[PDB]
Design a protein around this nucleic acid. Sequence first.
RNA 1: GCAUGGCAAGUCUAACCGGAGUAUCCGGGGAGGCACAGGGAAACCGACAUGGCCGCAGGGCUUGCCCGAGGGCCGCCGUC
RNA 2: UAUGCCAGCUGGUGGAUUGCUCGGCUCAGGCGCUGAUGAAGGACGUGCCAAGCUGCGAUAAGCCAUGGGGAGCCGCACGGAGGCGAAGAACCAUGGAUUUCCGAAUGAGAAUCUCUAACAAUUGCUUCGCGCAAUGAGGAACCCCGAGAACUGAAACAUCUCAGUAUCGGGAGGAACAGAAAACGCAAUGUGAUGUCGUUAGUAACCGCGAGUGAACGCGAUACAGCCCAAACCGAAGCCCUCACGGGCAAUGUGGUGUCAGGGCUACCUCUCAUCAGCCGACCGUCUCGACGAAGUCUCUUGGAACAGAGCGUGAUACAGGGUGACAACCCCGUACUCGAGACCAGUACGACGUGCGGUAGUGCCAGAGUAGCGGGGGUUGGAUAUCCCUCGCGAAUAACGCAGGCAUCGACUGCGAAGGCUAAACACAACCUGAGACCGAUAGUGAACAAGUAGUGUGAACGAACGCUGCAAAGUACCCUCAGAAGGGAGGCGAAAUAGAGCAUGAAAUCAGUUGGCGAUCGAGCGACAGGGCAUACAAGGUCCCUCGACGAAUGAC
Lengths: 115, 246, 145, 119
Amino acid sequence: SKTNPRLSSLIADLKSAARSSGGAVWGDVAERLEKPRRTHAEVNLGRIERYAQEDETVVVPGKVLGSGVLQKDVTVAAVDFSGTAETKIDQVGEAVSLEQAIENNPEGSHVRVIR
Amino acid sequence: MQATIYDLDGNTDGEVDLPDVFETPVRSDLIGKAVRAAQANRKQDYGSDEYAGLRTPAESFGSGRGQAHVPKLDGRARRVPQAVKGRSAHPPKTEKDRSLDLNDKERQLAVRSALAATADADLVADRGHEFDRDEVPVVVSDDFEDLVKTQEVVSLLEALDVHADIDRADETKIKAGQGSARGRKYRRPASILFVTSDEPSTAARNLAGADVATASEVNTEDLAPGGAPGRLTVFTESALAEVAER
Amino acid sequence: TSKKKRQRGSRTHGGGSHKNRRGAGHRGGRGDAGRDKHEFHNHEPLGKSGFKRPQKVQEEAATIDVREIDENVTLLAADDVAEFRVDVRDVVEEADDADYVKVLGAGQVRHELTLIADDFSEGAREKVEGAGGSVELTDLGEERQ
Amino acid sequence: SKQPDKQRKSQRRAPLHERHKQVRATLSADLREEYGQRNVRVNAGDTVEVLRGDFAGEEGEVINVDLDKAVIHVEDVTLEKTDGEEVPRPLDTSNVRVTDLDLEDEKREARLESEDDSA
RNA sequence: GCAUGGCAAGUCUAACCGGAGUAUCCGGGGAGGCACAGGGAAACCGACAUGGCCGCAGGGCUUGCCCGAGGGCCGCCGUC
RNA sequence: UAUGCCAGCUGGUGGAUUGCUCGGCUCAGGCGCUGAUGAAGGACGUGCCAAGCUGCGAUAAGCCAUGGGGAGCCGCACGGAGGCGAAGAACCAUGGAUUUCCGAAUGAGAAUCUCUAACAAUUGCUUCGCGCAAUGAGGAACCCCGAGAACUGAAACAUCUCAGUAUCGGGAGGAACAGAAAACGCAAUGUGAUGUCGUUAGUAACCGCGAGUGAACGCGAUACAGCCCAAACCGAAGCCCUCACGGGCAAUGUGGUGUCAGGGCUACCUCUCAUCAGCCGACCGUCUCGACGAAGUCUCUUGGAACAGAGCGUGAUACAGGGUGACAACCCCGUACUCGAGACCAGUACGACGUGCGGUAGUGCCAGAGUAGCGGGGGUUGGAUAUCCCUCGCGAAUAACGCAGGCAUCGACUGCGAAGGCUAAACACAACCUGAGACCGAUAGUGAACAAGUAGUGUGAACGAACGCUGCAAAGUACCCUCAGAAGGGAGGCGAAAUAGAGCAUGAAAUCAGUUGGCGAUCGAGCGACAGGGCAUACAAGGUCCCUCGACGAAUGAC
Ligand SMILES: [Cl-]
Ligand SMILES: [Cl-]
Ligand SMILES: [Cl-]
Ligand SMILES: [Mg+2]
Ligand SMILES: [Mg+2]
Ligand SMILES: [Mg+2]
Ligand SMILES: [Mg+2]
Ligand SMILES: [Mg+2]
Ligand SMILES: [Mg+2]
Ligand SMILES: [Mg+2]
Ligand SMILES: [Mg+2]
Ligand SMILES: [Mg+2]
Ligand SMILES: [Mg+2]
Ligand SMILES: [Mg+2]
Ligand SMILES: [Mg+2]
Ligand SMILES: [Mg+2]
Ligand SMILES: [Mg+2]
Ligand SMILES: [Mg+2]
Ligand code: NA
Ligand code: NA
Ligand code: NA
Ligand code: NA
Ligand code: NA
Ligand code: NA
Ligand code: NA
Ligand code: NA
Ligand code: NA
Ligand code: NA
Ligand code: NA
Ligand code: NA
Ligand code: NA
Ligand code: NA
Ligand code: NA
Ligand code: NA
Ligand code: NA
Ligand code: NA
Ligand code: NA
Ligand code: NA
Ligand code: NA
């Protein structure tokens, strides 16, 4: 039982997209968000840099933290970003909320899941 | 966004930018947690006498007389929990920590969130408040702080179509239960919160169910009584501005 | 509903036989009793090991990896820019109450760095020089001999 | 003291002089106008009208004032005992209104008139 | 340990101070704690921001083929 | 159909339940000593009638003064008789009078009485006389100095642990104690009296190296405050009693100087704003108490009673809480606002008086002994070689010296002067006042809401209960009848209600009387569950049910 109304709503949106549109990553991310918070992702920039690529949205089924350097001009989609992470990302690319990525890409295409 | 300032007659008088905080996502769960903490932290430590029931040399006769091994004195059972006049087994204790902690960041976020819930006419009506207005919170000029007679503040509220909320709170409830015997006989609905900047409205305070606070220290409770978001509030031109950096 | 809340009516509250939850015998003794007898298992073996040096003769080093320095060079605008030059002492937190500041060689160095510190590891030197950098030893650092 | 037990206690245990305040009744409009007071300590000379009991409506002269019990006897406000003897039916000053004052006391009238003090 | 929640390479204040609507509450307070490197009795020394291979989910493509976080198997590095 | 079974109805018994709270429990703020000028505590007295409680003390529920208060009053305690108060009583505050006997108990003796002037006893001063003084005892705990267990833990047990706990002896105050470095030892070019709070840390240290035990320096805060002798050099320049007179003390040193920013002495410079002694003497705040203090007691309906419903209206710097015949801001006390007094802060802070701070050079003049220290034996501590202490023995120096910096000796370095003394504030407790509460609500909560440490038990130390609720108002039942009758009963009266009628609100169960339904004197025992019948049943809150026939028709399935 999640307690955050925003997380609950987000999870429901993710589902709605996964079902309606042909997206399968949203329903996948939704299943991780339903799982215990401790299992959620906590990824620092150093990893997003090592495995991401341009024109491929990096999807973090958790939260992004500001440790390390990010140079690639990538679009990062997460549940939340540490104030530093968001700052460091918008410097070389773009940080986006999962709620936006669901609207901009309900088909969940050209996306890389990172944790 | 934009907030419409009102003069002491109930007529518009320009407008200012509704500060960003009122755009904070309403997070009732966090607001509820802050109110719970606030209410628990003012609760007083209590507990029965450490020695209640133990002031006796009572002893058990043991086997031999067809009686249960219960300590007795003058043929009267004592001390043990199952005995009348005996000690309370696991009673309330003074040593118990009845307080609750809350991270400053978490608490501040709830203040901002409750503050934001103020600018939502739908939430406000849902919370139970009675008014015939459309825009909210009700922004008023700094000259409100100069009012003296409560009756004056009434006419202003009647002008602002917000006085109905006070008719709502003008009904005390005589509670069910023994709280009555401890001075908690009555209870009443929460009405309008009046936030000013220099000092709390001495004029509005006595209004049925009203609360008066100051922008620098207004909290989660007055903003959301009982952890319920969306209280029909009225800010002061300066209060609004000051409340922004909270 | 919690576990405690469902106990009324269970009689034994999960202890099994009502003959179970009595005194210290049910625990095999009070506290750590029998740590090398009946309850030896998962206890570290008995005995003394080593010695300690007096607290006031011990030196506590303030350490930092190059990776940290290197990763924040741009962000460290409040520090000197050159042909970047940084006095580690002003970087590492807890540096006041420490006996000295040592730099360690973990990670990479993607910048021409000029570092000033009381101590450096062989790996810290190599890595910094391998990136066209210099290692400046403090006057305190002149203890190397 | 906001606690009910302490409130009721201080009333029942208040010393004699502090009990004068327990035998105060509301003054008529003419009297309120004339003395700048809303109520007054009912005296054995005053005349009063019953506003609340079974005797509400009736009027009469205050025959007695008991400070211990904080109650007054008003003329004709009686109860007929079994033997047929009419006896006084005690009244609380709160259910009563003063419509005439016995001003034979110099001191009473003095305080009754001075704006700085009450009676 | 676990579930929820805040913040995140950080996080939290303690006594205490000021304010106040005066035990709540608003603002100060990072002393200090834990985390940020380990190994060694000690002296003392001091590490992978990824080199290879499998491959789940997911994605891609001209529909078996690529990319494949996490995970698994190695390499390699600090120290005794 | 006896004796009788199950359930119900009427009445009872009982006192649960619900509602109520004059008592508790706990937290918080304030405040804090009393006593030979005989306390605290106890005994016995004291009232018109007086048994308990409270008060008081032969002047006995009280006497006097001042202030407040006010037309009433004569405690709890509501009777009867009587009395007091406008000559201002009651009641409240302050101050004073009185204040029996025992009691530290003090002339002597003694189970609260007695015998023939009394600080008994021990002390200091001393006119050497009890002439002037001191001590004694109490107090809720807190505080300081001594004595000091065991159950227990270690799954036995001895060191260890419980624990320097329980208990015991002695004693102070409103707070104690501590305290201006022979310190610390983040070793420093550093800190700078002492408590206490937070942390340092379950760290260092201890320990059948088992179980367990367990600091400090520092840091952040609170509050801040720093001084006086002994001696050197002076040498009676001095102090106490007494109005004075006069007496006493004091060369075995009173008094001056001086106290590590070492001092004295000698010669100089300069100067005082230190320090010490004495005078004056608060603000603010806080705690408590007090004054003043807004607005409906309007209509209708219900009711025994509006504080209810509906309608009309008002105050609010006051919508905290309580009272009042039912739910009250506006009926009464209060509550906001304003104002006043007392106490604490505090004889403190500020102020002023007096004094005189400091510096140079010279000077081996002075600077606390069974001490520092060593050894034997013990206790104690985390203190380990390196805690603190006791005991026996031994035992130094003299600043050109001495002690410390966690083993000893020597050297260096750094800190610092023991063996004399005083010291505000910040901290503990809760007797006392006041406030508060997601505490209990009469088998609870104190043992104690009640005669409560009461009744009562024990030779004694000691032990120790139970008992709350008529009603709006006593209107607490006149009169008549009956009766041995102030009993009880009948009739009757009051009230909304007596099934509110006195241990009287409500009034459960166990259970008792009478009574209704079912069963019943030829028949068998976990008392029932599920089926199906008899008999019984006011309404209400459930409304279904029966038979012919017909439609549908799983598995099964014939004559
Ligand atoms: Cl990461
Ligand atoms: Cl070590
Ligand atoms: Cl230091
Ligand atoms: Mg009890
Ligand atoms: Mg109830
Ligand atoms: Mg620090
Ligand atoms: Mg007047
Ligand atoms: Mg005698
Ligand atoms: Mg044992
Ligand atoms: Mg053992
Ligand atoms: Mg110990
Ligand atoms: Mg130390
Ligand atoms: Mg002197
Ligand atoms: Mg010991
Ligand atoms: Mg009891
Ligand atoms: Mg005996
Ligand atoms: Mg009854
Ligand atoms: Mg038969
Ligand atoms: Na007892
Ligand atoms: Na029995
Ligand atoms: Na507590
Ligand atoms: Na179990
Ligand atoms: Na059991
Ligand atoms: Na054990
Ligand atoms: Na810190
Ligand atoms: Na006191
Ligand atoms: Na008596
Ligand atoms: Na007396
Ligand atoms: Na004496
Ligand atoms: Na004498
Ligand atoms: Na054992
Ligand atoms: Na044994
Ligand atoms: Na041991
Ligand atoms: Na330090
Ligand atoms: Na009334
Ligand atoms: Na010795
Ligand atoms: Na030292
Ligand atoms: Na009782
Ligand atoms: Na039947």
